[PDB]
Design an enzyme around this catalytic site. Sequence first.
Site, PDB file in Angstrom:
ATOM      1  N   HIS A 124       0.680  -1.249   0.185  1.00  0.00           N
ATOM      2  CA  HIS A 124       0.271   0.046  -0.002  1.00  0.00           C
ATOM      3  C   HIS A 124       0.985   1.276   0.019  1.00  0.00           C
ATOM      4  CE1 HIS A 124      -3.026   2.883   2.049  1.00  0.00           C
ATOM      5  NE2 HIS A 124      -3.712   2.322   1.043  1.00  0.00           N
ATOM      6  N   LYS A 126       3.015   4.414  -0.993  1.00  0.00           N
ATOM      7  CA  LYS A 126       3.348   5.258  -2.390  1.00  0.00           C
ATOM      8  C   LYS A 126       4.337   6.071  -2.271  1.00  0.00           C
ATOM      9  CE  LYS A 126      -1.276   5.135  -0.871  1.00  0.00           C
ATOM     10  NZ  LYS A 126      -1.829   3.767  -1.400  1.00  0.00           N
ATOM     11  N   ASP A 131      17.511   8.904  -7.617  1.00  0.00           N
ATOM     12  CA  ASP A 131      18.740   8.853  -7.483  1.00  0.00           C
ATOM     13  C   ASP A 131      19.354   8.678  -5.945  1.00  0.00           C
ATOM     14  OD1 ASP A 131      19.119   9.363 -10.182  1.00  0.00           O
ATOM     15  OD2 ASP A 131      20.082  11.410 -10.145  1.00  0.00           O
ATOM     16  N   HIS A 398      -8.749  11.264   1.865  1.00  0.00           N
ATOM     17  CA  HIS A 398      -7.769  10.053   1.585  1.00  0.00           C
ATOM     18  C   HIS A 398      -6.537  10.195   2.380  1.00  0.00           C
ATOM     19  CE1 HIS A 398      -5.189   7.047  -0.549  1.00  0.00           C
ATOM     20  NE2 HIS A 398      -6.383   6.585  -0.513  1.00  0.00           N
ATOM     21  N   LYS A 400      -3.352  10.187   5.279  1.00  0.00           N
ATOM     22  CA  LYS A 400      -3.220   9.640   6.403  1.00  0.00           C
ATOM     23  C   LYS A 400      -2.188  10.548   7.385  1.00  0.00           C
ATOM     24  CE  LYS A 400      -3.903   6.681   2.842  1.00  0.00           C
ATOM     25  NZ  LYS A 400      -5.294   6.830   2.691  1.00  0.00           N
ATOM     26  N   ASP A 405       0.338  19.333  18.557  1.00  0.00           N
ATOM     27  CA  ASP A 405       1.064  20.699  19.237  1.00  0.00           C
ATOM     28  C   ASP A 405       1.875  21.594  18.374  1.00  0.00           C
ATOM     29  OD1 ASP A 405       0.401  19.343  21.342  1.00  0.00           O
ATOM     30  OD2 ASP A 405       2.108  18.393  21.930  1.00  0.00           O
TER      31      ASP A 405
HETATM   32  P1  LIG Z   1      -5.005   3.137   0.119  1.00  0.00           P
HETATM   33  O1  LIG Z   1      -6.129   2.006  -0.400  1.00  0.00           O
HETATM   34  O2  LIG Z   1      -5.017   3.673  -1.455  1.00  0.00           O
HETATM   35  O3  LIG Z   1      -5.484   3.987   1.184  1.00  0.00           O
END
Ligand SMILES: *[PH-](=O)([O-])[O-]
Length: 568
Positions: A124, A126, A131, A398, A400, A405
């Site tokens: 999952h 990304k 380089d 979408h 994360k 603080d």
């Molecule tokens: P993932 O299924 O892209 O958050």
Amino acid sequence: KDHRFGSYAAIQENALAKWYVNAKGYFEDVANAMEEANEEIFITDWWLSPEIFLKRPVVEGNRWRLDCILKRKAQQGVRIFIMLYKEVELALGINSEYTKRTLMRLHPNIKVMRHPDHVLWAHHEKLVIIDQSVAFVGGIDLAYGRWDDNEHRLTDVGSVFWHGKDYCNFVFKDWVIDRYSTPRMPWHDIASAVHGKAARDVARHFIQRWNFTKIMKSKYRSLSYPFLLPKSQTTELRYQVPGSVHANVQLLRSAADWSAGIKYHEESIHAAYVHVIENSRHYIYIENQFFISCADDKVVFNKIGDAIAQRILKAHRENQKYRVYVVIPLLPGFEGGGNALQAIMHFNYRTMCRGENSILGQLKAELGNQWINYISFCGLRTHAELEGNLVTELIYVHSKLLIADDNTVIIGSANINDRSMLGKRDSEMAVIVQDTETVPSVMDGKEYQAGRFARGLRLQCFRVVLGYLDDPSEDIQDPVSDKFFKEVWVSTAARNATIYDKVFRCLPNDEVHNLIQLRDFINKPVLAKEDPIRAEEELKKIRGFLVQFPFYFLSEESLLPVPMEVWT
Ligand SMILES: *[PH-](=O)([O-])[O-]
């Protein structure tokens, strides 16, 4: 070596780091970093769509289309390595087999793997690494539907920004695509870049998976798939992402034998999340695609929801001001149809408010009615006119993202769910950034030294969701005062929710408790259609995208019907 949180990577002090709110800046900087590559481009994706444009509106023809960038760099001698998630044969999905063939046909310097074989969990993370010196880590795939800017537009009838298949809407609408009837679903997300030794840490994770997968599959055992080597730690690239600042960073991941060939699983993202919450002093801000937690050590295991509840109760016990902001999607997206949607809604609500074990359950038992002083649950929504008709759609959160603080951030691919956090399931990558440089700031009316990196990102978040882009920002500078919490955050979420409910009668909402009320509800007249002049007058009072999350949607339904852990 033993590293903080049991990560595979060390703390890199004074690393150069960048954050991104939405994909527009992210894809532009990725394109410019790739353009300057001289040796190696590494890419990982859950889904990769080769024909997306990385700079928009489009000029210079196909110069910034993803496949054309990769092909011209391969032609210059840059070796390009791509690892794709291999979806189930039965998935309508991600089309990784087609995408692999497309990519490898562009030039022989481009090599693609797919994993895992199915004759299970997913990859999952990304990532883009150039380089082994600049690396991008976030929630944004190089895929259809992801590109967006801070306006989160519902329409594009000239096809200026979302050509063809890039105009998407993954919101469920089959409770019982064409851009002239149907609005797009806006894509709200977060990403980051790191340089130097931190980037080499991202590369090491990619190399470990690449070599592991090479030796494990017949098709990749040939010389044609290079065995990869980490760049010596002794040694960079003539590109610095503009806008970056120095901070302490640390890479984190979820990984295990099946995904990376390591003997003991790693769940350093999870550990970091719990630590940051536990050690926060003033507020945490969460934007996440999922909100599945509160461990019963039977069906759900990750410790995040319980850490939140327990941090709030500490603030109450010490008579301290403390705030928790939670922004998740109003409905789960599908990229099994409706039973899948309902299962995720079950567990999201189970964390929020359904059960004595819920976050709200725990707070009530100790705080009773004072919980409203400590936490707010929201989603995002917007509206527009399409072909003469008022429309609305939710903005897909979408992201994360965790901020604490105004000095600590975690950005990555891991959702608040066991799939992402336990480490043994999906493979994931995140980075923790802790500020070392501070600016004069304010926190509950008091002088306060905020972190450059985290404060900047929290303020940009606030501006987007509260509606202060390009406006005087005094009202949003202090993230914990009674004045901000009540008069800006909670008031905006309630105001916008009320307006949208009145004008559009949109789902989800607090009135529809069962599926049969839903059908009758949606057959009733809608002001947006019956009196558009009045509707448009009411919508002029919307500010920002934030809307209060409805606790009672499908309250009475047992939202469960496939093993439970697929949904958790
Ligand atoms: P993932 O299924 O892209 O958050």
